[PDB]
Amino acid sequence: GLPVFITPGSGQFLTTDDFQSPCALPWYHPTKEISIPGEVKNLVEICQVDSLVPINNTDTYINSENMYSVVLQSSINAPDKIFSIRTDVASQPLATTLIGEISSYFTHWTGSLRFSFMFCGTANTTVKLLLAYTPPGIAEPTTRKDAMLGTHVIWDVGLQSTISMVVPWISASHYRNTSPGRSTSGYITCWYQTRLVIPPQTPPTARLLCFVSGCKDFCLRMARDTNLHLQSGAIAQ
Amino acid sequence: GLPVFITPGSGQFLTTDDFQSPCALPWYHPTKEISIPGEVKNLVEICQVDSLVPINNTDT
Amino acid sequence: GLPVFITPGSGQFLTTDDFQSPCALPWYHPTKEISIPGEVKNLVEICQVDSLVPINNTDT
Amino acid sequence: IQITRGDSTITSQDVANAIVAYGVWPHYLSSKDASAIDKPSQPDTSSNRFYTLRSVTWSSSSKGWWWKLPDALKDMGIFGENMFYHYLGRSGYTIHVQCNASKFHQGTLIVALIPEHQIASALHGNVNVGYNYTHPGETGREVKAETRLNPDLQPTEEYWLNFDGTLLGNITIFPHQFINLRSNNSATIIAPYVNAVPMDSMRSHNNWSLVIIPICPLETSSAINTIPITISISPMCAEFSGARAKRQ
Amino acid sequence: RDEMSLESFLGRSGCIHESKLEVTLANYNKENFTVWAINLQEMAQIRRKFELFTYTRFDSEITLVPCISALSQDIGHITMQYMYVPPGAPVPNSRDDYAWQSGTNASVFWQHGQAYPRFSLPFLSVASAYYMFYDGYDEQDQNYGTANTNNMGSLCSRIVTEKHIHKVHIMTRIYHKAKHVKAWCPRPPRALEYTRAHRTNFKIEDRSIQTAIVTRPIITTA
Amino acid sequence: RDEMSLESFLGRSGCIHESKLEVTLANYNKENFTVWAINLQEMAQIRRKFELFTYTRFDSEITLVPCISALSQDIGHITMQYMYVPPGAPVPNSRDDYAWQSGTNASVFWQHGQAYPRFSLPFLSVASAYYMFYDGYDEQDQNYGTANTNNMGSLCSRIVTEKHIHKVHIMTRIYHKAKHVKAWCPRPPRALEYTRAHRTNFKIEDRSIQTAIVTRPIITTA
Amino acid sequence: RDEMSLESFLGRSGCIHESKLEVTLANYNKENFTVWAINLQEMAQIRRKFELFTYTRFDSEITLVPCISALSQDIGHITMQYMYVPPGAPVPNSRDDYAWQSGTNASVFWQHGQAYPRFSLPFLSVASAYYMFYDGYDEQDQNYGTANTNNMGSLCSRIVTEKHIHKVHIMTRIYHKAKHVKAWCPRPPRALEYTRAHRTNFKIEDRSIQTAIVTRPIITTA
């Protein structure tokens, strides 16, 4: 009939192939589709959702909602530096957040992240927090001064319980490896510009929340298996 | 001749497949068809026919 | 389906062949290309570059 | 302002800065999606009003609360009866969570509406959650330390794990709203019906599940150191099918 | 963002089930046939991925990789019969049950040295999607969590040859691939080990709850 | 309603006949060949389906699935010859009968490791349809029920190789598939067990007539 | 000059790696799997050719040539599984590691008598080209010369069958072919023997530096 020449690779089963295959139920007409709200089409949709960062991941608060908040003091003797976290999507604490989890399912990432903060204090409690970003390459600041000498924000809580700041994408290559780096990672440091000021008969302390999501330019490439979930159990039915 | 690549599934016999096959009697011209009354084309035709329900299905 | 005739040479692996092959990472979008100076396209480019001849190739 | 819907009317709802679950507004079942070809009509504004549950007490030790819909409203006048005297039904809601506090109170709540919120059982082994405990009614389910009965039937108490093995703090992937006392004191969520079928047995399947976790503990210097959380739910485009004789 | 599409994330093929069959001499029928209720929740990695959404819909591509092993006495040529039994149809319970020759079921015969078998299945549920989670109960108000509309059928296999049987082992890796995928209502990722199929249960006996969150000594030092 | 079309209901393939052939040493010819008169009434399930109509017409697709089993002494390579003898043509009665090389018959050779044989047959009757039922008699006024125009021919098989024969068993499942189906005059479904081929007989010895109708104690309670 | 194009010079296929696997009886898992980090610098001839440029970019075509050798006791039918693990993904470390069934990796199954396996890989680096040379250092200021962006993944292989294992040897020649090649910044050809991978080191112990330059007695006589 028609002269054909078989090519190297024929008959092989490549788990990542893409060919047609006979339908086992050719006559069956599948149930119609209906309108279910919330269709997701791209994982980026999930990455742009702010999720709480377990900022206070110490042994004391490890398995409680307290691992998601930091306690701000009003006493004059609390250390200037409040908390610090690396900016690599896959590094702790970010790792276990929404964007962190989806990122752990890929090998290359790129883009900017958006950190948002919420002051869980009283309506009369005011304070000035210094939120500073440190580019990759240099070790995180050690004093309020050094911190404000770099890029930062003097956030005045009274009158605005929320604020966001965008960490830019600074890298040699277009996309960077999904695995956490220390010398190749940035830092987010929070400092007391002033302590908590409050009127009489008011809680001397207040909590602080931290959120994170990717921006429009956030993107992932080359899927791998997440390492945030290790299954070593029965899974008995 | 023409470069081809064999796909997973080739040579298999899927009982629900649908492919052509050589005619064993290529020259034979089958008896013509005539008009027989009552052609059925869909089982729904049979389902729309009222039938008695054995309503009194007791042992008696 | 479509009558085919296998030609002598099928299934062989000729190290100098030229056929397509399934991509193992079909979804992966490779890093964009940037402008690196000095692209070479033909070895003749290298042959037209004067180079010193070891004219005095003695043991000394 | 005040949203008056039916013979019920709740004050303090104000502007419309509420969230609309998954961006879809509650709608009546379209004939195209309908199960039994189409039904002549299903227009009934009778079940569309505000049912206000008893206010729950938020103390400095409160860990969380959750209700399941439609379950919570199984005993709420018309809606309740309707879902009891019909085989199938579908409905959207307008949940309205608000708490009374002063500028001298501080705290934060996460009010999330979770679809198909399949709870996890408390114990280890081959156990499962029992019907009675996932259908607490309007009373809801409070996170307690006390020991309960049919323990192997009881659902988990691990609120920080969203009661289902996921991490609280990722719970924001569901339609939600934060209630930061020093900013807002109420949240509102308008959710449409969500399921893989047009209608269902309201008795056996709870589509939505309203969860309320205090992410930032309540603190205050007032005499009574606790505030109330009031919840008002209003059915949206409720539809029913397979009606049966009542009062029989 | 093309690689971040559902098709790319869930549409990859993975081994959803390992099926071993051993030739037994005592009785011809015995339990030589193997029956497995199709379920994509058996593999944790695969499960966690799908459980990222509440509802999913998709077609399937099953590929079979048979691995024959002969301890001794040749028996090189054997014919295998893999059969797919649709949801609701009766499953075989003997190597010679009638099910094996029924025309409503789909079967594919494979004799060693043949290309790996492969076939497709359309969206099977009676609902418009598969439930990844179900806050509902049975009709008996029991077995809460699992959904009956989610049934996908069974994969069966029997050795067709007769006496050439010399106690040989048969391993059949079953690869599944979700095609034309659609998902609804994203949920947070599973943070703990799975313990049961069709249940979000996570508590393990005499073991502390362990998350992916790694603890540090002080929060001022990243 | 597409799946409720005749093509969907009767057009599915099923195993209409199992054909076993065993190597016998005494005589080369013996009865090594196997002859089977094509008949779709042998399998109850398949029969009841077709007997849902009075007259049917359709083309056929025969697929052969050979299963060789070697007890011992190798003999791995053997060539099989399947032959189709049209209605009215003489059937073979020896492994070396002339019929096997005749050109009016259709034969297909199969050697293990080859794709399963398959061929098509056109509507064979001399009438315009096959009779599912026949309220008539023979020309001798006997054998009432069966119709002569309904003959479809025979499927034959012989081992072609010569002495490499070391007493090996051959199983050949024959799959048939009705194509381009047409049916006339629907009839009620068969309610009892079949007892004879080509006869509606239903009475079984020393056994009560048993229907599909399940009895209940009282008609006021469903 | 068409044959002097980069495509012609570097685009030819060559054996970049020899992979031997031997059946070991002590433990089923053992180290039966084989893992190799893809590297085109292992073969001097191939290396010198590429090292003619500073930066290169290209897609790849891997072809596998399996050579089975049975010392005794048959075991003729065995199924091989070759797997490609992308850069950064975890590599298997046991014959039954989970990696072998993961869907993010690419696997190809080969059973003897089948066409040689073959698949393609796109440009893998996170940079815009592969570095043939690197006047740079590690992040730790160590291992200068090698570039991390140059990682190309790993080729793994395991015997899939179970007990039919009768101590047989498996040789797998891996052929690679650079496709759609591009190169930048030509460099002089390597004049000495290579001594290390990823290092221009040339000094060999107790041996004089030997070039390709042949010496003559007098320069007035060609």
Author numbering:
A (entry chain 3): 1 to 237
B (entry chain 3), C (entry chain 3): 1 to 60
D (entry chain 2): 14 to 261
E (entry chain 1), F (entry chain 1), G (entry chain 1): 62 to 283
Text lifted from the article:
Here we report the 3.0 Å resolution crystal structure of the HRV2 empty particle. Analysis of the electron density confirmed the absence of VP4, as predicted from comparison with the poliovirus uncoating scenario and the cryo-EM structure of HRV2 previously determined at 15 Å. Externalization of N-terminal residues of VP1 in the empty capsid is compatible with the lack of ordered electron density up to position 1062 (VP1, VP2 and VP3 proteins are numbered starting with 1000, 2000 and 3000 respectively). When compared with the corresponding 314 Å diameter of the native virions, this implies an average expansion of 3.8%, which is in accordance with the observations derived from electron microscopy studies for this virus and other related picornavirus particles. Thus, the rearrangement of VP1 in the 80S empty capsid with respect to the native virion can be explained by a hinge-type movement, consisting in an approximately 5.6° outward rotation of one of these two regions with respect to the other. However, in the 80S particle these subunits are displaced with regard to the VP1 ß-barrel by between 4 and 6 Å towards the icosahedral three-fold axis. In the structure of the 80S particle, the density within the pocket is absent and the cavity appears collapsed. Surprisingly, the 80S empty particle possesses pores or breaks crossing the capsid shell. These pores, absent in the HRV2 native virions, connect the canyon floor with the internal surface of the particle, close to residues Arg1062-Glu1068. Altogether, these changes disrupt 13 interactions of the native capsid and produce a break in the interface between pentamers that crosses the capsid along the two-fold symmetry axes.
Like all members of the Picornaviridae family, HRVs consist of a T = 1 (pseudo T = 3) icosahedral capsid of about 30 nm in diameter that is built from 60 copies of each of 4 coat proteins VP1, VP2, VP3, and VP4, protecting a plus-sense single-stranded RNA genome. In HRV2, a member of the minor group HRVs, upon binding to lipoprotein receptors (LDL-R) on the cell surface virions are taken up into vesicles and directed to early endosomes. The low pH conditions found in the endosome, and not the binding to LDL-R, catalyze the delivery of the viral genome. After release of the RNA, empty capsids (B-particles) sedimenting at 80S appear and polyprotein synthesis commences.
